[PDB]
Amino acid sequence: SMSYTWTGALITPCAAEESKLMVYATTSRSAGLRQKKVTFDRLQVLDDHYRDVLKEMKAKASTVKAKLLSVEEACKLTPPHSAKSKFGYGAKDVRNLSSKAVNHIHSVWKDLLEDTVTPIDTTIMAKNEVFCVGRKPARLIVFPDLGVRVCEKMALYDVVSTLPQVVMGSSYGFQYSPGQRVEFLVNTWKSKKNPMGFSYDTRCFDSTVTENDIRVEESIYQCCDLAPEARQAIKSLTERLYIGGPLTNSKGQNCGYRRCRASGVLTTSCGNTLTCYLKASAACRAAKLQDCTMLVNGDDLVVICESAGTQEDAASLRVFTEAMTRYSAPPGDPPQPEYDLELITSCSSNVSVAHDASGKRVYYLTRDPTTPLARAAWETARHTPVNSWLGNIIMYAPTLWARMILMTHFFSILLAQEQLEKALDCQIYGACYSIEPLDLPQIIERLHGLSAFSLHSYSPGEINRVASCLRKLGVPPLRVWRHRARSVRARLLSQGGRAATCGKYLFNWAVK
Numbered sequence: 001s002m003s004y005t006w007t008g009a010l011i012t013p014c015a016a017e018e019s020k021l022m023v024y025a026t027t028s029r030s031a032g033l034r035q036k037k038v039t040f041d042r043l044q045v046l047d048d049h050y051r052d053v054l055k056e057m058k059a060k061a062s063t064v065k066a067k068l069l070s071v072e073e074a075c076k077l078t079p080p081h082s083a084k085s086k087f088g089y090g091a092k093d094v095r096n097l098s099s100k101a102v103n104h105i106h107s108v109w110k111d112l113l114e115d116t117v118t119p120i121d122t123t124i125m126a127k128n129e130v131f132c133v134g135r136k137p138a139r140l141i142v143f144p145d146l147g148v149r150v151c152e153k154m155a156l157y158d159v160v161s162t163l164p165q166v167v168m169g170s171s172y173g174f175q176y177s178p179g180q181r182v183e184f185l186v187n188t189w190k191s192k193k194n195p196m197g198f199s200y201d202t203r204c205f206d207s208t209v210t211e212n213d214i215r216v217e218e219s220i221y222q223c224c225d226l227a228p229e230a231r232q233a234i235k236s237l238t239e240r241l242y243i244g245g246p247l248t249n250s251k252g253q254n255c256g257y258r259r260c261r262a263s264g265v266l267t268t269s270c271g272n273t274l275t276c277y278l279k280a281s282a283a284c285r286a287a288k289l290q291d292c293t294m295l296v297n298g299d300d301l302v303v304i305c306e307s308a309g310t311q312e313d314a315a316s317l318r319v320f321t322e323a324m325t326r327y328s329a330p331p332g333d334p335p336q337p338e339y340d341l342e343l344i345t346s347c348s349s350n351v352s353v354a355h356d357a358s359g360k361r362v363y364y365l366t367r368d369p370t371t372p373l374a375r376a377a378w379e380t381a382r383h384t385p386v387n388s389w390l391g392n393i394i395m396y397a398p399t400l401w402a403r404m405i406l407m408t409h410f411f412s413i414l415l416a417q418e419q420l421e422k423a424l425d426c427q428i429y430g431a432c433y434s435i436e437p438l439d440l441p442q443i444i445e446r447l448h449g450l451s452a453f454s455l456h457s458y459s460p461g462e463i464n465r466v467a468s469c470l471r472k473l474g475v476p477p478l479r480v481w482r483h484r485a486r487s488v489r490a491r492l493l494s495q496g497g498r499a500a501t502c503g504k505y506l507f508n509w510a511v512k
Ligand SMILES: Cn1c(-c2ccccc2)c(C2CCCCC2)c2sc(C(=O)O)cc21
Pocket: 023, 132, 373, 374, 375, 376, 377, 380, 405, 406, 409, 473, 474, 475, 476
């Protein structure tokens, strides 16, 4: 079946959007190009490898017990800036347990229990994201109304937060902080006698997810020991929402119909990760890969196994790809065997190595800095809700580029504007935090360890990547950042207190 059908009505913005300050932001103007790419017929043919892996996943899922959340619990766990309901209340009313919201949520719940067939309405919007130099079109986001979204937590929050780690174990990527993720990847790599690894990412993954895939996911959830109302709600959600439904634009027009994964539902991440794990584990068996270990984060897969030799390895990957494709998930770019862990990129990132103060080798997670730099650039001139700059500084604190460029430039600006003490909203790991810049040393220490303030002797390859990207983008070279940092550090130190703590920890590297 067609992943989507379209009426011709346009995907419309609900606010002024911005396409420029090179660096661009996606807008609804490009929605059409995305629509075209994401619209196609799915062919899927399952085989015994698939059935066998599924069986094993269900056996694990059958050891999980999950509860319903009360309306109140689901209200409190609703994010503060999520889109308001069409029924007269918003997130803040949900979070503060307003009778309007609570009564509507209860009525949505009752409807889900009493009707398991009527397709539920969704809104479709174009995502506004910043990229750098062609242009990629806007990604689409499909979500139901706020009341429905609270009900999804009621039925499934306890499931999505407990089940995936049980079914997928160490392969469930979302359990890992950056350093833990590296630790898993390095230990896996070092465990193989002659390691080979590869990344795979599916072309339009959400569009490739079929009705059957979504029903198989539901059948995994129903293996859990659940309350009878939960079972009914999960069924109803699956039939009325997850498998598909009508799409409405921001102006209330009907845009069409969805027969694939909606991107804006509670189960998107868990379900995509489970479905990718299922197809990829079965594809590892088809390909006959030896001593396979997988890491999955949605449709971002890394596989590390024992090499069977160069040509053998190249042929097995084609076999893996062929299996993935029969299962509905062809790659954007064909996977390539890698024999150096540093060269495997997944979730836009890769493992690299540096040295701590003692000279000990320390592995850490990095990435190509072009997008982070471009987003930081945007945020110097505009301003937004996520403050990706700050998020990158935190998640990529041990990297040469976050330390030399992002930390420097941003403290430079905070100092100049006297806003060291002003908290900033920052979206990280799906949550919105209010972060004070002076709190960074503690945050980084907790997330990455003290060695993050002491890494040196970066790998040549990583240093040259940073240098190249700066050259490509016309940003000053590393020597200038070091000079700037020495100045930033002196200034911080001059202020004493916590400002000095920042200078000392964040900018220890810039000292002579
Ligand atoms: C060009 N440029 C950029 C930049 C612009 C577009 C995309 C990425 C980085 C930047 C970004 C500014 C925000 C932090 C990362 C670098 C800077 S700083 C600078 C200077 O002369 O001091 C020049 C630039």
